[PDB]
Every structure is written in C-alpha cells, then in structure tokens.
C-alpha cells in the first residue's frame, strides 16, 4: 500500500524463539505451547523515530532450510533478524550459514541484518555476550539481546533492523 512498510524476516535454528519473538512483538504476550498456530506473516502499525509504519514480520519457523519457500521469504525480505538462543551453543554456531545464505540470495555483501541473542531472561547461558559482540563487530552489524518472555530488548531488535534498512 501507500503507508511505509518494512518486511522483516526472522531466521535461526529451530527452537531459538523466532515465533515467540514475533508474537511478543506484535501481540504482546509470550507463547510456550506444544502445538501453536504460527502465521506466515504478522503485521502491526507502530511508530519508530516518529515514523508511522507497518511492520510485516515474516517468521521462517517450520520451513525446510533449503526449500523454495525459505528462498522466497529471503527474496521478499528487506531485512533479517538472525536469531540464536544464548543457552544453545549449536544455534550460535548456525548463525554463519544463515548470514551466508542471505548474502547469496541477495547477491550482496551488505544486506540489512541484526544479530539477536534471545532468551536473555534465562539464568545459565552457554554463549557469552563477548562472543556475540565480537561476531557482530566482525560482521559490522548490530547485536541485540532479547527475551520473548519478558519483552526485554524485543522492540530494540526489530526497530534496530528497521534503522538498518533505512540507511542501506
């Protein structure tokens, strides 16, 4: 439509909280269910730095990693949240392949992207902030620690990505 709209794609290993982050952002509650309904897109009008806009959150949960659908989400997306869980080391190790996939799909070394360390409400993390800080600095992108449970950092993560899209 005519109202300013940002297409934000959430990627990351299964179980890191892509869907929980999305539902917390848009619907203001925390989901921890065995079999929830996840929408292909969630939209909401917000104000970011004085700008009224629509966010369209495209959650890639449930898609196969190399599926055409996953490719389609990456091609339509304007910016990406690359999410890992701070208590799952494998999910952090997966980040590299997601970033490289997005770069190749966009055919660009510079795609709007943020790194998100989710579940920051949890006690006993396995990925220290330092490791993620150094990774984000090497990528030249923002890093945000978030909790889909408490909402800590959640707006920061998505709004920081909008700011990256703007300056692209």
């Amino acid at each position: 439509g005519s109202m300013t709209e940002y297409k934000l794609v959430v990627v990351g290993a299964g179980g890191v909280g892509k869907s929980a982050l999305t539902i917390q952002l848009i619907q203001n509650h925390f989901v921890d269910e065995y079999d929830p309904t996840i929408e292909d897109s969630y939209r909401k009008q917000v104000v970011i730095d004085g700008e009224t806009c629509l966010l369209d959150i495209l959650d890639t949960a449930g898609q196969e990693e190399y599926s055409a659908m996953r490719d389609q989400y990456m091609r339509t997306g304007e910016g990406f949240l690359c999410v890992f869980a701070i208590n799952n080391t494998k999910s952090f190790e997966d980040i590299h392949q997601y970033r490289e996939q997005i770069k190749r799909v966009k055919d660009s070394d510079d795609v709007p992207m943020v790194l998100v360390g989710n579940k920051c409400d949890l006690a006993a993390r396995t990925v220290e902030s330092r490791q993620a800080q150094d990774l984000a600095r090497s990528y030249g992108i923002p890093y945000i620690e978030t909790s889909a449970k408490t909402r800590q950092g959640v707006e920061d993560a998505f709004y920081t990505l909008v700011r990256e899209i703007r300056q692209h």
Binding site: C120, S129, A132, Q133, A136, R137, I141, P142, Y143, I144, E145, T146, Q152, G153, D156, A157, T160
Partner: protein, 92 residues
C-alpha cells in the same frame, strides 16, 4: 552528535599517521578504525575502548585518505557503534 569527537592527525610521516580522538562519557568496548583512499576497498582494524589513539601505516605518500572511527559499545540491549561515526580527510 559525533562519537567519538575531535578526530585528528597529531603526527605523520610520508607513509604513516598517528590519530587521536576524544572518548565519550559512555563505556566504549572497541573503536573500529577504517581508512581508504578518498579516490575510491577500505582497510579496517580496532583498538580497545580504553585507548583513544592509533597509528596507521603502509600508506601511499601524497594520497588523500578518508579515516573513520566507530565507537562500538552497549546502549541498553543494543551493541553497535554509538552516535555518529567521525571522519576526517588527510593527505601525507
């Protein structure tokens, strides 16, 4: 506002520069320094946030360079460079 502030070349040789800047009040994790010929890839390195000087070596004499300093640190839950990065132009 620029972060850091007052970036300047304080000493030089035909192939090298010593740069200095003024740290902000906030805690900086690392400063990332980039430099490239103003007639355009950029080279990059970093120094810890406890330091506010750097040297740049291996430059071409008589060539204009664009030098930019980025102050990476926390702002609440967001870790990124803070404020607006500061840049100067300089020719040895």
């Amino acid at each position: 506002s620029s972060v850091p502030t007052k970036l300047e070349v304080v000493a030089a040789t035909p192939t090298s520069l010593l740069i200095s800047w003024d740290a902000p009040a906030v805690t900086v994790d690392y400063y990332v320094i980039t430099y490239g010929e103003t007639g355009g890839p950029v080279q990059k390195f970093e120094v810890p946030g406890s330091k506010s000087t750097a040297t740049i070596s291996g430059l071409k004499p008589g060539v204009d360079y664009t030098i930019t300093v980025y102050a990476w640190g926390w702002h609440g839950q967001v870790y990124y460079y803070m404020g607006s990065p500061i840049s100067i132009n300089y020719r040895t």
